Amino acid sequence: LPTAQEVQGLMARYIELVDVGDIEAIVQMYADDATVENPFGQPPIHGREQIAAFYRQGLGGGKVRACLTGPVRASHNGCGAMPFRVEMVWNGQPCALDVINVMRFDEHGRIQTMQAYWSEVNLSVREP
Amino acid sequence: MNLPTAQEVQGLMARYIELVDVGDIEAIVQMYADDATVENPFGQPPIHGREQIAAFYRQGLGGGKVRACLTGPVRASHNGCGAMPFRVEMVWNGQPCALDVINVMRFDEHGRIQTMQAYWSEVNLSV
Numbered sequence A: 001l002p003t004a005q006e007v008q009g010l011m012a013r014y015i016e017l018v019d020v021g022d023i024e025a026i027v028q029m030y031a032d033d034a035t036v037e038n039p040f041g042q043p044p045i046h047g048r049e050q051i052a053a054f055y056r057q058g059l060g061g062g063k064v065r066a067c068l069t070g071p072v073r074a075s076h077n078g079c080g081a082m083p084f085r086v087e088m089v090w091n092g093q094p095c096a097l098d099v100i101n102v103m104r105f106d107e108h109g110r111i112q113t114m115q116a117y118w119s120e121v122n123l124s125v126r127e128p
Numbered sequence B: 001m002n003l004p005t006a007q008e009v010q011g012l013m014a015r016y017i018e019l020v021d022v023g024d025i026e027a028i029v030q031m032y033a034d035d036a037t038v039e040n041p042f043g044q045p046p047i048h049g050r051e052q053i054a055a056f057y058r059q060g061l062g063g064g065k066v067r068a069c070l071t072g073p074v075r076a077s078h079n080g081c082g083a084m085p086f087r088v089e090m091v092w093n094g095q096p097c098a099l100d101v102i103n104v105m106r107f108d109e110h111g112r113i114q115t116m117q118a119y120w121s122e123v124n125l126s127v
Protein backbone atom coordinates (compact mmCIF):
# COMPACT_ATOMS: atom_id res chain seq x y z
CA LEU A 1 0.00 0.00 0.00
CA PRO A 2 1.69 3.07 -1.16
CA THR A 3 3.35 5.32 1.38
CA ALA A 4 2.67 9.13 1.21
CA GLN A 5 5.80 9.64 -0.89
CA GLU A 6 4.84 6.73 -3.21
CA VAL A 7 1.36 8.26 -3.65
CA GLN A 8 3.03 11.56 -4.63
CA GLY A 9 5.06 9.74 -7.25
CA LEU A 10 2.12 7.72 -8.64
CA MET A 11 -0.20 10.73 -8.86
CA ALA A 12 2.41 12.78 -10.65
CA ARG A 13 3.08 9.87 -13.03
CA TYR A 14 -0.65 9.75 -13.81
CA ILE A 15 -0.58 13.44 -14.83
CA GLU A 16 2.51 12.76 -17.05
CA LEU A 17 0.68 9.90 -18.81
CA VAL A 18 -2.41 12.08 -19.39
CA ASP A 19 -0.11 14.95 -20.66
CA VAL A 20 1.44 12.71 -23.30
CA GLY A 21 -1.89 11.01 -24.07
CA ASP A 22 -0.66 7.44 -23.39
CA ILE A 23 -4.13 5.89 -23.02
CA GLU A 24 -2.88 2.35 -22.61
CA ALA A 25 -0.44 3.26 -19.92
CA ILE A 26 -3.08 5.25 -17.98
CA VAL A 27 -5.38 2.25 -17.99
CA GLN A 28 -2.54 0.10 -16.63
CA MET A 29 -2.38 2.38 -13.59
CA TYR A 30 -5.94 1.49 -12.58
CA ALA A 31 -6.98 -1.65 -10.71
CA ASP A 32 -8.82 -3.98 -13.04
CA ASP A 33 -11.94 -3.10 -10.90
CA ALA A 34 -11.41 0.64 -10.24
CA THR A 35 -14.12 3.17 -10.21
CA VAL A 36 -13.82 6.66 -11.64
CA GLU A 37 -16.20 9.57 -11.07
CA ASN A 38 -15.21 12.33 -13.58
CA PRO A 39 -16.63 14.81 -13.01
CA PHE A 40 -17.60 14.01 -9.46
CA GLY A 41 -21.41 14.06 -9.27
CA GLN A 42 -21.81 11.89 -12.36
CA PRO A 43 -22.54 8.13 -12.44
CA PRO A 44 -19.26 6.30 -11.96
CA ILE A 45 -17.51 4.19 -14.48
CA HIS A 46 -16.44 0.79 -13.43
CA GLY A 47 -13.45 -1.46 -14.45
CA ARG A 48 -10.65 -1.30 -16.97
CA GLU A 49 -12.59 -1.50 -20.21
CA GLN A 50 -14.98 1.41 -19.38
CA ILE A 51 -12.09 3.36 -18.07
CA ALA A 52 -10.12 2.80 -21.27
CA ALA A 53 -13.13 4.07 -23.29
CA PHE A 54 -13.20 7.18 -21.18
CA TYR A 55 -9.55 8.07 -21.78
CA ARG A 56 -9.76 7.18 -25.45
CA GLN A 57 -12.69 9.51 -25.95
CA GLY A 58 -11.09 12.32 -23.91
CA LEU A 59 -7.51 12.10 -25.13
CA GLY A 60 -7.54 10.17 -28.43
CA GLY A 61 -8.32 13.21 -30.58
CA GLY A 62 -5.02 14.67 -29.43
CA LYS A 63 -4.60 18.34 -28.61
CA VAL A 64 -4.93 17.77 -24.82
CA ARG A 65 -2.23 18.59 -22.24
CA ALA A 66 -2.27 18.34 -18.45
CA CYS A 67 0.09 19.71 -15.82
CA LEU A 68 0.21 19.94 -12.05
CA THR A 69 -0.50 23.38 -10.76
CA GLY A 70 0.60 22.58 -7.19
CA PRO A 71 2.02 19.68 -5.20
CA VAL A 72 0.32 16.37 -4.62
CA ARG A 73 -1.08 16.11 -1.07
CA ALA A 74 -0.75 12.59 0.17
CA SER A 75 -2.07 10.69 3.17
CA HIS A 76 -0.74 7.77 5.21
CA ASN A 77 -3.62 5.50 4.05
CA GLY A 78 -2.76 5.23 0.36
CA CYS A 79 -4.72 8.29 -0.75
CA GLY A 80 -3.96 11.69 -2.12
CA ALA A 81 -5.28 14.82 -3.89
CA MET A 82 -3.68 17.05 -6.57
CA PRO A 83 -4.54 20.22 -8.49
CA PHE A 84 -3.90 20.41 -12.21
CA ARG A 85 -4.92 22.19 -15.37
CA VAL A 86 -6.14 20.42 -18.50
CA GLU A 87 -5.70 22.29 -21.80
CA MET A 88 -7.90 21.56 -24.86
CA VAL A 89 -9.37 23.22 -27.95
CA TRP A 90 -13.18 23.33 -27.88
CA ASN A 91 -14.66 24.12 -31.33
CA GLY A 92 -11.78 26.51 -31.97
CA GLN A 93 -11.55 28.05 -28.51
CA PRO A 94 -8.33 27.29 -26.65
CA CYS A 95 -9.40 26.41 -23.10
CA ALA A 96 -8.01 25.54 -19.71
CA LEU A 97 -9.93 23.45 -17.18
CA ASP A 98 -8.82 23.48 -13.54
CA VAL A 99 -9.37 20.09 -11.85
CA ILE A 100 -8.47 18.38 -8.55
CA ASN A 101 -8.22 14.62 -8.54
CA VAL A 102 -8.60 12.58 -5.38
CA MET A 103 -7.25 9.01 -5.58
CA ARG A 104 -7.20 5.96 -3.39
CA PHE A 105 -4.64 3.21 -4.24
CA ASP A 106 -4.82 -0.46 -3.44
CA GLU A 107 -2.27 -2.70 -1.81
CA HIS A 108 -0.69 -3.30 -5.25
CA GLY A 109 -0.10 0.38 -6.01
CA ARG A 110 -2.96 0.52 -8.53
CA ILE A 111 -5.67 3.24 -8.56
CA GLN A 112 -8.75 1.83 -6.82
CA THR A 113 -10.89 4.96 -6.89
CA MET A 114 -10.59 8.32 -8.58
CA GLN A 115 -12.76 11.37 -8.21
CA ALA A 116 -12.11 14.43 -10.45
CA TYR A 117 -13.66 17.59 -9.02
CA TRP A 118 -14.51 20.27 -11.63
CA SER A 119 -17.46 21.76 -13.43
CA GLU A 120 -17.99 24.44 -16.07
CA VAL A 121 -17.09 27.17 -13.54
CA ASN A 122 -13.56 25.79 -13.80
CA LEU A 123 -13.32 26.23 -17.59
CA SER A 124 -11.83 29.30 -19.13
CA VAL A 125 -10.73 30.54 -22.54
CA ARG A 126 -6.97 30.77 -22.30
CA GLU A 127 -4.04 30.26 -24.67
CA PRO A 128 -1.89 27.24 -23.82
CA MET B 1 -29.48 28.78 0.99
CA ASN B 2 -30.58 25.36 -0.30
CA LEU B 3 -27.93 22.95 -1.79
CA PRO B 4 -25.28 25.23 -3.06
CA THR B 5 -24.78 25.61 -6.81
CA ALA B 6 -21.20 25.23 -8.16
CA GLN B 7 -20.69 28.98 -7.94
CA GLU B 8 -22.06 29.05 -4.41
CA VAL B 9 -19.71 26.22 -3.38
CA GLN B 10 -16.79 28.22 -4.70
CA GLY B 11 -17.88 31.23 -2.64
CA LEU B 12 -18.42 29.29 0.53
CA MET B 13 -15.10 27.46 0.31
CA ALA B 14 -13.26 30.71 -0.35
CA ARG B 15 -15.01 32.28 2.63
CA TYR B 16 -13.91 29.37 4.83
CA ILE B 17 -10.26 30.10 3.98
CA GLU B 18 -10.74 33.81 4.73
CA LEU B 19 -12.08 32.94 8.14
CA VAL B 20 -9.23 30.51 8.86
CA ASP B 21 -6.76 33.25 7.83
CA VAL B 22 -8.13 35.70 10.39
CA GLY B 23 -8.73 33.04 13.07
CA ASP B 24 -12.51 33.66 13.35
CA ILE B 25 -13.23 30.40 15.07
CA GLU B 26 -16.82 31.15 15.93
CA ALA B 27 -17.68 31.96 12.26
CA ILE B 28 -15.90 28.81 11.08
CA VAL B 29 -17.91 26.68 13.46
CA GLN B 30 -21.13 28.29 12.20
CA MET B 31 -20.22 27.23 8.61
CA TYR B 32 -20.48 23.53 9.65
CA ALA B 33 -23.63 21.49 10.01
CA ASP B 34 -24.47 20.72 13.64
CA ASP B 35 -23.39 17.11 13.17
CA ALA B 36 -20.64 17.56 10.53
CA THR B 37 -17.48 15.50 10.43
CA VAL B 38 -13.94 16.64 10.00
CA GLU B 39 -11.01 14.38 8.96
CA ASN B 40 -7.85 16.46 9.24
CA PRO B 41 -5.52 15.06 8.08
CA PHE B 42 -7.46 12.64 5.96
CA GLY B 43 -6.41 9.23 7.21
CA GLN B 44 -7.08 10.12 10.84
CA PRO B 45 -10.35 9.29 12.58
CA PRO B 46 -13.17 11.79 12.06
CA ILE B 47 -14.30 14.12 14.73
CA HIS B 48 -18.02 14.75 14.98
CA GLY B 49 -20.28 17.70 15.84
CA ARG B 50 -19.88 21.38 16.35
CA GLU B 51 -18.27 21.26 19.79
CA GLN B 52 -15.54 18.81 18.78
CA ILE B 53 -15.02 20.87 15.66
CA ALA B 54 -14.80 24.09 17.67
CA ALA B 55 -12.27 22.47 20.04
CA PHE B 56 -10.24 21.37 17.05
CA TYR B 57 -10.12 24.82 15.57
CA ARG B 58 -9.38 26.49 18.87
CA GLN B 59 -6.34 24.13 19.27
CA GLY B 60 -5.21 24.70 15.66
CA LEU B 61 -5.66 28.42 15.32
CA GLY B 62 -5.97 29.71 18.89
CA GLY B 63 -2.22 30.63 19.12
CA GLY B 64 -2.86 33.38 16.56
CA LYS B 65 0.18 32.72 14.31
CA VAL B 66 -1.55 30.88 11.46
CA ARG B 67 -2.32 32.38 8.08
CA ALA B 68 -3.97 30.67 5.11
CA CYS B 69 -4.53 31.47 1.47
CA LEU B 70 -5.92 29.85 -1.65
CA THR B 71 -3.15 28.76 -4.08
CA GLY B 72 -5.58 28.06 -6.95
CA PRO B 73 -9.28 28.11 -7.79
CA VAL B 74 -11.94 26.29 -5.95
CA ARG B 75 -13.16 23.27 -8.01
CA ALA B 76 -16.91 22.75 -7.62
CA SER B 77 -19.37 20.07 -8.59
CA HIS B 78 -23.09 20.24 -9.39
CA ASN B 79 -23.97 18.21 -6.29
CA GLY B 80 -22.86 20.63 -3.58
CA CYS B 81 -19.23 19.48 -3.23
CA GLY B 82 -15.93 21.01 -3.96
CA ALA B 83 -12.12 20.88 -3.56
CA MET B 84 -9.53 23.61 -3.09
CA PRO B 85 -5.76 23.93 -2.86
CA PHE B 86 -4.32 26.28 -0.26
CA ARG B 87 -1.28 26.97 1.84
CA VAL B 88 -1.18 27.43 5.61
CA GLU B 89 1.72 29.39 7.22
CA MET B 90 2.68 28.84 10.81
CA VAL B 91 5.63 28.03 12.99
CA TRP B 92 7.28 24.53 13.18
CA ASN B 93 10.30 23.96 15.41
CA GLY B 94 10.83 27.70 15.96
CA GLN B 95 10.90 28.68 12.30
CA PRO B 96 8.30 29.96 9.78
CA CYS B 97 6.92 27.01 7.80
CA ALA B 98 4.34 26.41 5.11
CA LEU B 99 2.00 23.42 4.62
CA ASP B 100 0.15 22.71 1.36
CA VAL B 101 -3.33 21.30 1.84
CA ILE B 102 -6.34 20.34 -0.26
CA ASN B 103 -9.76 20.41 1.36
CA VAL B 104 -12.63 18.36 -0.08
CA MET B 105 -15.99 19.45 1.28
CA ARG B 106 -19.61 18.48 0.91
CA PHE B 107 -22.35 21.02 1.73
CA ASP B 108 -25.81 20.14 2.87
CA GLU B 109 -29.14 21.37 1.58
CA HIS B 110 -28.82 24.39 3.88
CA GLY B 111 -25.43 25.47 2.60
CA ARG B 112 -23.53 24.22 5.73
CA ILE B 113 -20.47 21.94 5.57
CA GLN B 114 -21.50 18.36 6.19
CA THR B 115 -18.11 16.77 5.65
CA MET B 116 -14.56 18.19 5.65
CA GLN B 117 -11.52 16.13 4.48
CA ALA B 118 -8.15 17.90 4.59
CA TYR B 119 -5.51 16.11 2.55
CA TRP B 120 -1.95 16.73 3.64
CA SER B 121 1.02 15.06 5.35
CA GLU B 122 4.55 15.80 6.31
CA VAL B 123 5.52 15.57 2.62
CA ASN B 124 3.68 18.90 2.25
CA LEU B 125 5.55 20.77 5.02
CA SER B 126 8.43 23.06 4.14
CA VAL B 127 10.51 25.60 5.86
Ligand SMILES: C[C@]12CCc3c(ccc4cc(O)ccc34)[C@@H]1CCC2=O
Binding pocket: A018, A038, A058, A059, A064, A086, A088, A097, A099, A101, A116, A118
Ligand atom coordinates in the same frame (compact mmCIF):
# COMPACT_ATOMS: atom_id res chain seq x y z
C1 LIG C 1 -12.43 15.11 -21.21
C2 LIG C 1 -11.71 16.43 -21.31
C3 LIG C 1 -10.21 16.24 -21.61
C4 LIG C 1 -9.55 15.42 -20.48
C5 LIG C 1 -10.07 15.71 -19.04
C6 LIG C 1 -11.14 16.56 -18.83
C7 LIG C 1 -11.60 16.81 -17.51
C8 LIG C 1 -11.04 16.18 -16.41
C9 LIG C 1 -9.95 15.31 -16.60
C10 LIG C 1 -9.38 14.67 -15.53
C11 LIG C 1 -8.39 13.72 -15.71
O1 LIG C 1 -7.88 13.05 -14.67
C12 LIG C 1 -7.88 13.48 -17.00
C13 LIG C 1 -8.43 14.14 -18.08
C14 LIG C 1 -9.49 15.09 -17.91
C15 LIG C 1 -11.82 17.27 -20.01
C16 LIG C 1 -13.34 17.56 -19.97
C17 LIG C 1 -13.62 17.96 -21.47
C18 LIG C 1 -12.58 17.22 -22.26
O2 LIG C 1 -12.46 17.25 -23.48
Ligand SMILES: C[C@]12CCc3c(ccc4cc(O)ccc34)[C@@H]1CCC2=O
Binding pocket: B020, B040, B060, B061, B066, B088, B090, B091, B099, B101, B103, B118, B120
Ligand atom coordinates in the same frame (compact mmCIF):
# COMPACT_ATOMS: atom_id res chain seq x y z
C1 LIG D 1 -3.10 23.08 12.56
C2 LIG D 1 -2.15 23.71 11.54
C3 LIG D 1 -2.52 25.14 11.21
C4 LIG D 1 -3.91 25.08 10.51
C5 LIG D 1 -4.14 23.87 9.59
C6 LIG D 1 -3.25 22.79 9.47
C7 LIG D 1 -3.52 21.72 8.61
C8 LIG D 1 -4.66 21.67 7.86
C9 LIG D 1 -5.65 22.68 7.98
C10 LIG D 1 -6.84 22.58 7.28
C11 LIG D 1 -7.81 23.56 7.44
O1 LIG D 1 -8.95 23.46 6.78
C12 LIG D 1 -7.54 24.67 8.28
C13 LIG D 1 -6.32 24.76 8.96
C14 LIG D 1 -5.33 23.77 8.83
C15 LIG D 1 -1.93 22.90 10.25
C16 LIG D 1 -1.38 21.52 10.80
C17 LIG D 1 -0.31 22.05 11.85
C18 LIG D 1 -0.78 23.47 12.13
O2 LIG D 1 -0.12 24.32 12.75
